[PDB]
Ligand binder design. Structure first.
Ligand SMILES: O=C(c1ccc2ccccc2c1)[C@@H](c1cccc2ccccc12)P(=O)(O)O
Length: 223
């Protein structure tokens, strides 16, 4: 999270910490609790052995509130393109049901086809890198004004306004970055997007996954 500020310890229970460090490289990832035994994260944060941890703030410290539940099944989107980076969404069925508490509890998802007009004020969180020189052990966050699909349409190559979202204001040196991939973009207390990709420079706008479009699959997969 570039330009963001540290979140109030456990202010975001649904915030999950991905640890792909085992079956596919070793680079932390974001994710949010959508259900009791399901976590939503980018389809690229995949691994053959992911260890999710709920109810945390500082991953570099053994918090008694922390919940270390391994991923029993990391499902990727049937049409997740690796070249165009489309359908970048993945669900993680924990090996057990999280113990819902003030520190751990699912987040409300948006409705099908639920749009997100530009000018909206969203908030993204995650333990991602604050910069390309330093990182962070404690979950940080920042607000991102959703911009029109016009911008990202003249920046990124494979950008679909139907399944992707154009977030982040270029005029501001603040936005999701390396390590935030998977973190949800909550707008109106509703996880609307998922940090997909962006300019390797960390300079916004950036691309976010439109969850409201992958509802059918989301439900079908969990159900
Ligand atoms: O390289 C990445 C990257 C780079 C620049 C960024 C700029 C702004 C916002 C996010 C950005 C993310 C990701 C990443 C790592 C490793 C493999 C990936 C495969 C597909 C998509 C992302 C992947 P990440 O390590 O999962 O975080």
């Amino acid at each position: 999270i570039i330009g963001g500020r540290e979140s109030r310890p456990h202010s975001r229970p649904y915030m999950a910490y991905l640890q792909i460090q085992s079956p596919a490289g070793q680079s932390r990832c974001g994710g949010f609790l959508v259900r009791e035994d399901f976590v939503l994260t980018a389809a690229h944060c995949w691994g053959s052995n992911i260890n999710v941890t709920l109810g945390a703030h500082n991953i570099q410290r053994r918090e008694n509130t922390q919940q270390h539940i391994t991923a029993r099944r990391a499902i990727r989107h049937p049409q997740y393109n690796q070249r165009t980076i489309q359908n970048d969404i993945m669900l993680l069925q924990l090996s057990r049901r999280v113990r819902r508490n003030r520190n751990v509890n699912p987040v409300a998802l948006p409705r099908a086809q639920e749009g997100l007009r530009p000018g909206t004020l969203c908030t993204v969180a995650g333990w991602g890198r604050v910069s390309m020189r330093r990182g962070t052990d404690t979950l940080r966050e920042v607000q991102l004004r959703v911009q029109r699909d016009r911008q990202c349409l003249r920046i990124f190559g494979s950008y679909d306004p139907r399944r992707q979202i154009c977030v982040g204001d270029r005029r501001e040196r603040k936005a999701a970055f390396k390590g935030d991939s998977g973190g949800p973009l909550l707008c109106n207390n509703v996880a609307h997007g998922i940090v997909s990709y962006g300019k390797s420079s960390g300079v916004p706008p950036e691309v976010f996954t439109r969850v409201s479009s992958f509802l059918p699959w989301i439900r079908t997969t969990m159900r």
